[PDB]
Amino acid sequence: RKRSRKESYSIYVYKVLKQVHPDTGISSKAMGIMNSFVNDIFERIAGEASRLAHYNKRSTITSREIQTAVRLLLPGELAKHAVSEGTKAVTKYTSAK
Amino acid sequence: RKRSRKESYSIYVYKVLKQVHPDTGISSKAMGIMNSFVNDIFERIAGEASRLAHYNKRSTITSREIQTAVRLLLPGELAKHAVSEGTKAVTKYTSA
Amino acid sequence: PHRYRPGTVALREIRRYQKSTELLIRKLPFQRLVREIAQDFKTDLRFQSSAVMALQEACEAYLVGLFEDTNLCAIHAKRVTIMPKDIQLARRIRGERA
Amino acid sequence: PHRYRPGTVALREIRRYQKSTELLIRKLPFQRLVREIAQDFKTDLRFQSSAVMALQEACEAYLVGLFEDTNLCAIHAKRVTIMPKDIQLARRIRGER
Amino acid sequence: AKSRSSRAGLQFPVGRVHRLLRKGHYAERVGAGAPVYLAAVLEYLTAEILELAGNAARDNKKTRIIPRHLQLAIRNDEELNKLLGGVTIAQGGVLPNIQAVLLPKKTSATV
Amino acid sequence: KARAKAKSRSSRAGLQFPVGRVHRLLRKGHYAERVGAGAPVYLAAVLEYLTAEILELAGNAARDNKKTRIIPRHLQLAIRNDEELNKLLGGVTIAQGGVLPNIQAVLLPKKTSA
Amino acid sequence: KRHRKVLRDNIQGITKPAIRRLARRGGVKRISGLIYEETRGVLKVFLENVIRDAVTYTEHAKRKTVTAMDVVYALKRQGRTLYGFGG
Amino acid sequence: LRDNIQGITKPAIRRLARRGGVKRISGLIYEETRGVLKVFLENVIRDAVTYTEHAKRKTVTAMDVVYALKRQGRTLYGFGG
DNA sequence: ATCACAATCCCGGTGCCGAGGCCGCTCAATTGGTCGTAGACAGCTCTAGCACCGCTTAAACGCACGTACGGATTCCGTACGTGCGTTTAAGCGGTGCTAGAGCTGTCTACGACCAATTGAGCGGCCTCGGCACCGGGATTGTGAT
DNA sequence: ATCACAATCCCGGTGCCGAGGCCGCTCAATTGGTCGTAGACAGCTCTAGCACCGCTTAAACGCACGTACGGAATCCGTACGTGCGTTTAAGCGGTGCTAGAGCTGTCTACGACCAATTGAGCGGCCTCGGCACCGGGATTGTGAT
Ligand SMILES: [Cl-]
Ligand SMILES: [Cl-]
Ligand SMILES: [K+]
Ligand SMILES: [K+]
Ligand SMILES: [Mn+2]
Ligand SMILES: [Mn+2]
Ligand SMILES: [Mn+2]
Ligand SMILES: [Mn+2]
Ligand SMILES: [Mn+2]
Ligand SMILES: [Mn+2]
Ligand SMILES: [Mn+2]
Ligand SMILES: [Mn+2]
Ligand SMILES: [Mn+2]
Ligand SMILES: [Mn+2]
Ligand SMILES: [Mn+2]
Ligand SMILES: [Mn+2]
Ligand SMILES: [Mn+2]
Ligand SMILES: [Mn+2]
Ligand SMILES: [Mn+2]
Ligand SMILES: [Mn+2]
Ligand SMILES: [Mn+2]
Ligand SMILES: [Mn+2]
Ligand SMILES: [Mn+2]
Ligand SMILES: [Mn+2]
Ligand SMILES: [Mn+2]
Ligand SMILES: [Mn+2]
Ligand SMILES: [Mn+2]
Ligand SMILES: [Mn+2]
Ligand SMILES: [Mn+2]
Ligand SMILES: [Mn+2]
Ligand SMILES: [Mn+2]
Ligand SMILES: [Mn+2]
Ligand SMILES: [Mn+2]
Ligand SMILES: [Mn+2]
Ligand SMILES: [Mn+2]
Ligand SMILES: [Mn+2]
Ligand SMILES: [Mn+2]
């Protein structure tokens, strides 16, 4: 027989799981929910980022559109922590040219 | 002098107003509401057509994505009439 | 004989069902209702088994949620008994109903 | 001499305000609240006057709608008088909390 | 028929809609038929509300449609009220509507 | 002039989530004509942060339920007991989640015993 | 082509106890006898609405098989986003 | 900018109630209504100001408010967009 | 309070199947390089946002007074919850059939990209008719009697 | 019933200014040509949806019975609507100041696109440890007394 390659975020969700709870697993259904969750928030932030660019007559989605999209979409503390992780990752990456 | 170009559906709203109520006019604010409406429904129909093409791995939005978008977005009779006017307008354009 | 006072078994049932996550409508009846309704829209539709399970998970969560709002409408009226007028108010305020 | 019975004027006021479209909050106290609230998120902000008018249109239409739902919660309890518990139930069911 | 609108039998601007569809981050490609169907749909919905709105104007002895007429037209039409259920019409007000239990008792007997 | 020891954009960013993947999904998504280099890094970092947050609370729910594996019920308990995750996912149904134990006070039986 | 039997009155397979169970999960202690037919009616409207959108996606894709994804996309349209079937 | 919430007067709230079909109003509604209004305005203005900052402006536009209301499921017609 | 007794809770034993690890092949992310253009930036204009003040007056305010509403109480009838024995059909595990999902390879109609052309639609300017606002004085609606 | 009297209606008058038309300049739509690949279309494999069937049970069902519920009916106290005189400040308008929005032009850093490259992540394949299920004791609450 053959295959049919379907991408999911499963390996990254496992890696992150291993970091926070090193002796915990996850059922395929729970992983299904985490995959739903990642796809959902992705679409929300990119969607909002698209509009932000369009509203401001800009051709390009930058980290700054992502940042503004995050403050609009996430509540309170979640937004603060999300922006720090975002800012830290972009600062680190731009040094690692 | 000369303000920056600000596009609107105003001339087309008036042309349709005159087909329907030739003796009727329209306030500036009412024309603002009608513009908001066209922009709103444009956004909703184009948005659905976008998702529809993507769910089906298509790079192109055809009148077929617009029709399905319209069936998902419009209630019952509005949809029947909207599909009819849309199909009629493609047909008559494909011929001429 | 032994006889529970009315409300005691109802309260046990709330504790048991709020503790579990299992689908509460029997599956075969749910699947025939899905096929009858779908048929009336288009004939000769098949269903992935998982499509019927997605509809059953969505329908059950919608109704569990509605019954919460409905309960709050009953209690608002100083009742303990949900009535169709409570469902109608919750649906009206939800924007599901005119 | 003579006086209208309680509720007779209130009916008349409903008929009057449901016939009309005019904004029912004095514009200048509304404008001060908007500015006061804005300052907590960003100091030395200006507003297009049409920006404050958009906010006033949106707030009064929301509150009118909330008052319709509140009224139905009051009548549901066999009352003719709206109370805070009525606003709270309408907002809980609207999913505003 | 130089203009796509005239070719389509439309008042609304097919060329403009085609441009907005292309510039609008909806797909890599837009078929020729798409902006005809969409323009047509937009005209039809515009006609439908301007028809009910014009009626409201005449009913209120006015020559000119104002926002109130648009609000009366939309909220009194089942399908339009459902389409625009999430929308506030600036300066629209609301439909006259008093709950039966709020009305006085009709004097109720004689005189 | 040897070029490569392959270095993931994820490793450059200090992330487990795939910067490569996320960039490609942003270029294929018809979101804008162009996507900057930082966009996918920031976005991948926000998706990682929120994942960590749900898995932290879900792991704890599993451990409370005497289980080593996270099930959807654990994700629902985590999400619905957290004010901000609950708001973020207020319009989302978790299949096989069930609900929080919650009985309105008035429904509880009258004062008994001592 | 055998043709499956005719489907009639299947709304009644949403039984009084199944509806009690749902109400219990929803925190309900006491249930008027008219609740069962009102619930059936509310459920029918919800199912018709989601199935209508889902079959519209199925038609658009030129299939005769309603996928989980057509239901998931139909739920999302209706503001009833469902996780766990290909979200 | 001290206590501008009380600028929303008992009578102004009573007018809004009237347009919403309300015949009789408890004395506690006025403070309840003020709380609800502040929460509504805080939520819409936070988002509007956020669009302002992203546009690197210092002036809140109608359009900022219209995008804010759209995000909150409170779409407003008559102010552009 | 002080019981018997249901129903739930908790425990370790049982055995089963899906979580999770390996493995090897492949598609997609990476490296490196070229080319053109979006937007950051710097400069300049004049819009419209803001401050401030005086007058006019309608709206807000607060206080008196009394009605009709909400809430507490008592009651009575039967709609519901509980539990019994009987009835019903879901669930399960099984085989048996093929429809249609979904993948590949082919290959041209169709939509992107482009240059050159011109008329549809935009802002500027102007005015006059629709409608807001008024008060004359008419009939209706509310409440006192 | 009668009888204010405030509200409501409709009327023609009147004076304001924005709807809507005319003009003429311009940029975005159209025309006609190129060129590349998206997707129709046909063919092929085989996953998974559907259908039939016979048990075994647990769930669904109808019915007896009663009690706690909901709703009807009454009474009492004051919250809240109405109307007044008094105070407040919104709205108006007109003047006077400058922030900064919104536009321009310049130049280059940055992201699209292309080729060559290789290992991250895929499905296939396998297994054994987590947990669903069980039966059997302890423990917890309810209802009787
Ligand atoms: Cl097309
Ligand atoms: Cl960037
Ligand atoms: K300005
Ligand atoms: K199949
Ligand atoms: Mn940890
Ligand atoms: Mn155990
Ligand atoms: Mn296996
Ligand atoms: Mn696996
Ligand atoms: Mn390997
Ligand atoms: Mn690689
Ligand atoms: Mn490079
Ligand atoms: Mn530029
Ligand atoms: Mn009463
Ligand atoms: Mn089977
Ligand atoms: Mn076949
Ligand atoms: Mn096929
Ligand atoms: Mn062509
Ligand atoms: Mn013009
Ligand atoms: Mn007069
Ligand atoms: Mn008259
Ligand atoms: Mn007149
Ligand atoms: Mn004009
Ligand atoms: Mn001309
Ligand atoms: Mn042209
Ligand atoms: Mn292809
Ligand atoms: Mn029997
Ligand atoms: Mn009672
Ligand atoms: Mn004035
Ligand atoms: Mn002024
Ligand atoms: Mn300056
Ligand atoms: Mn500037
Ligand atoms: Mn630069
Ligand atoms: Mn794998
Ligand atoms: Mn193993
Ligand atoms: Mn073992
Ligand atoms: Mn098992
Ligand atoms: Mn057991």
Short mmCIF file of C-alpha atoms (C1' of nucleotides) in Angstrom, two decimals, chain I:
data_model
loop_
_atom_site.label_atom_id
_atom_site.label_comp_id
_atom_site.label_asym_id
_atom_site.label_seq_id
_atom_site.Cartn_x
_atom_site.Cartn_y
_atom_site.Cartn_z
"C1'" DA I 1 -29.26 12.69 68.03
"C1'" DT I 2 -28.99 7.41 66.64
"C1'" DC I 3 -29.85 3.70 64.24
"C1'" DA I 4 -30.10 0.52 59.34
"C1'" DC I 5 -29.15 0.54 54.46
"C1'" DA I 6 -28.66 2.12 50.05
"C1'" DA I 7 -25.32 3.96 46.77
"C1'" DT I 8 -20.90 5.61 46.07
"C1'" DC I 9 -15.97 5.30 46.74
"C1'" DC I 10 -11.59 2.96 46.76
"C1'" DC I 11 -8.58 -0.88 46.32
"C1'" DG I 12 -5.58 -4.30 43.82
"C1'" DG I 13 -5.99 -7.90 40.25
"C1'" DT I 14 -6.70 -8.78 35.12
"C1'" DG I 15 -5.71 -8.41 30.41
"C1'" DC I 16 -5.77 -5.59 26.22
"C1'" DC I 17 -4.74 -2.32 22.89
"C1'" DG I 18 -3.11 2.23 21.53
"C1'" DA I 19 0.95 5.41 23.14
"C1'" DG I 20 5.12 5.91 21.91
"C1'" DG I 21 9.72 4.24 20.12
"C1'" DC I 22 12.48 2.60 16.14
"C1'" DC I 23 13.55 2.85 11.43
"C1'" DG I 24 14.28 4.19 6.72
"C1'" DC I 25 12.78 7.00 2.76
"C1'" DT I 26 11.49 11.36 1.09
"C1'" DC I 27 9.67 15.95 0.71
"C1'" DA I 28 10.39 20.48 2.37
"C1'" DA I 29 13.22 23.56 4.91
"C1'" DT I 30 17.76 25.42 4.23
"C1'" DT I 31 21.80 27.52 1.93
"C1'" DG I 32 23.27 30.74 -1.10
"C1'" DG I 33 22.60 34.05 -4.63
"C1'" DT I 34 20.15 37.52 -7.73
"C1'" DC I 35 16.83 41.48 -8.58
"C1'" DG I 36 13.27 45.18 -7.64
"C1'" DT I 37 10.59 47.49 -4.79
"C1'" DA I 38 7.92 48.68 0.28
"C1'" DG I 39 8.47 51.41 3.41
"C1'" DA I 40 11.56 53.88 6.70
"C1'" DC I 41 12.82 58.12 6.91
"C1'" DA I 42 13.13 63.21 6.39
"C1'" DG I 43 10.80 67.42 4.85
"C1'" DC I 44 6.71 70.30 4.19
"C1'" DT I 45 1.79 71.64 4.15
"C1'" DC I 46 -2.58 73.06 6.10
"C1'" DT I 47 -6.37 70.21 8.22
"C1'" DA I 48 -9.16 69.88 12.15
"C1'" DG I 49 -8.36 68.93 17.01
"C1'" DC I 50 -8.11 71.72 21.05
"C1'" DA I 51 -8.42 75.79 24.48
"C1'" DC I 52 -10.85 79.35 26.02
"C1'" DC I 53 -14.68 82.57 27.00
"C1'" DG I 54 -19.68 84.74 27.24
"C1'" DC I 55 -24.43 84.10 26.73
"C1'" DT I 56 -28.83 81.61 26.55
"C1'" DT I 57 -31.70 78.27 28.39
"C1'" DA I 58 -32.97 73.46 28.57
"C1'" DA I 59 -31.74 69.86 31.20
"C1'" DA I 60 -30.31 68.07 35.69
"C1'" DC I 61 -31.15 68.26 40.48
"C1'" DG I 62 -33.33 67.56 44.87
"C1'" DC I 63 -37.25 67.40 47.48
"C1'" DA I 64 -42.53 66.55 48.65
"C1'" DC I 65 -45.86 63.49 48.27
"C1'" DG I 66 -48.74 59.22 47.47
"C1'" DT I 67 -49.78 55.06 44.38
"C1'" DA I 68 -49.25 50.57 42.86
"C1'" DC I 69 -45.70 47.52 43.01
"C1'" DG I 70 -42.81 43.94 44.90
"C1'" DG I 71 -42.27 40.74 48.40
"C1'" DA I 72 -43.73 37.95 52.35
"C1'" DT I 73 -47.35 34.69 53.74
"C1'" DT I 74 -50.80 31.23 53.50
"C1'" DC I 75 -53.02 27.66 50.78
"C1'" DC I 76 -54.55 24.05 47.88
"C1'" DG I 77 -54.28 20.91 43.78
"C1'" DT I 78 -51.62 17.93 40.97
"C1'" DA I 79 -47.37 17.89 38.11
"C1'" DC I 80 -43.51 15.66 38.63
"C1'" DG I 81 -39.84 12.43 40.81
"C1'" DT I 82 -39.16 7.68 42.44
"C1'" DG I 83 -39.28 2.80 41.98
"C1'" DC I 84 -41.50 -1.48 40.19
"C1'" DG I 85 -42.03 -5.17 36.67
"C1'" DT I 86 -42.41 -5.52 31.61
"C1'" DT I 87 -41.09 -4.35 27.14
"C1'" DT I 88 -37.87 -2.83 23.64
"C1'" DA I 89 -34.04 -2.21 20.72
"C1'" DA I 90 -29.03 -0.63 21.29
"C1'" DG I 91 -24.78 -2.51 21.14
"C1'" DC I 92 -21.73 -5.87 19.72
"C1'" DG I 93 -19.05 -8.79 16.84
"C1'" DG I 94 -19.47 -10.84 12.32
"C1'" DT I 95 -19.35 -11.37 7.43
"C1'" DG I 96 -19.95 -9.71 2.70
"C1'" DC I 97 -20.16 -6.16 -1.03
"C1'" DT I 98 -18.72 -2.16 -3.80
"C1'" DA I 99 -19.08 2.94 -4.08
"C1'" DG I 100 -16.66 6.50 -4.22
"C1'" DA I 101 -12.61 8.74 -1.93
"C1'" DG I 102 -8.59 10.08 -3.25
"C1'" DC I 103 -4.37 9.75 -5.83
"C1'" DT I 104 -1.67 10.05 -10.61
"C1'" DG I 105 -0.58 11.59 -15.01
"C1'" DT I 106 -2.04 14.34 -19.06
"C1'" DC I 107 -2.37 18.63 -21.23
"C1'" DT I 108 -5.08 23.24 -22.72
"C1'" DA I 109 -8.25 26.74 -21.32
"C1'" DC I 110 -7.82 30.47 -18.44
"C1'" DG I 111 -5.92 34.08 -15.46
"C1'" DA I 112 -1.40 36.72 -14.35
"C1'" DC I 113 1.48 39.98 -16.03
"C1'" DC I 114 2.37 43.84 -19.15
"C1'" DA I 115 2.10 48.26 -22.19
"C1'" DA I 116 -0.63 51.71 -24.13
"C1'" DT I 117 -4.98 54.01 -24.40
"C1'" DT I 118 -9.28 56.98 -22.68
"C1'" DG I 119 -13.52 57.61 -20.27
"C1'" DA I 120 -15.68 56.51 -15.57
"C1'" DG I 121 -15.49 58.46 -11.44
"C1'" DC I 122 -13.49 61.64 -8.46
"C1'" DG I 123 -13.25 66.45 -6.13
"C1'" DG I 124 -14.70 71.45 -6.71
"C1'" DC I 125 -18.20 74.58 -6.93
"C1'" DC I 126 -22.99 76.07 -6.82
"C1'" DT I 127 -28.21 76.46 -5.74
"C1'" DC I 128 -32.84 75.77 -4.62
"C1'" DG I 129 -36.18 72.44 -2.93
"C1'" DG I 130 -36.97 69.18 0.97
"C1'" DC I 131 -37.84 69.31 5.40
"C1'" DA I 132 -37.26 71.00 10.15
"C1'" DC I 133 -39.29 74.10 12.97
"C1'" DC I 134 -43.15 77.12 14.40
"C1'" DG I 135 -47.68 78.48 16.22
"C1'" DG I 136 -52.90 78.67 14.97
"C1'" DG I 137 -56.49 76.28 16.78
"C1'" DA I 138 -58.79 71.25 16.24
"C1'" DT I 139 -60.04 66.60 18.40
"C1'" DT I 140 -58.51 63.03 21.47
"C1'" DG I 141 -56.98 60.89 25.82
"C1'" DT I 142 -56.36 60.99 30.84
"C1'" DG I 143 -58.04 61.60 35.24
"C1'" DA I 144 -60.93 64.36 38.49
"C1'" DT I 145 -65.89 64.36 39.70
#
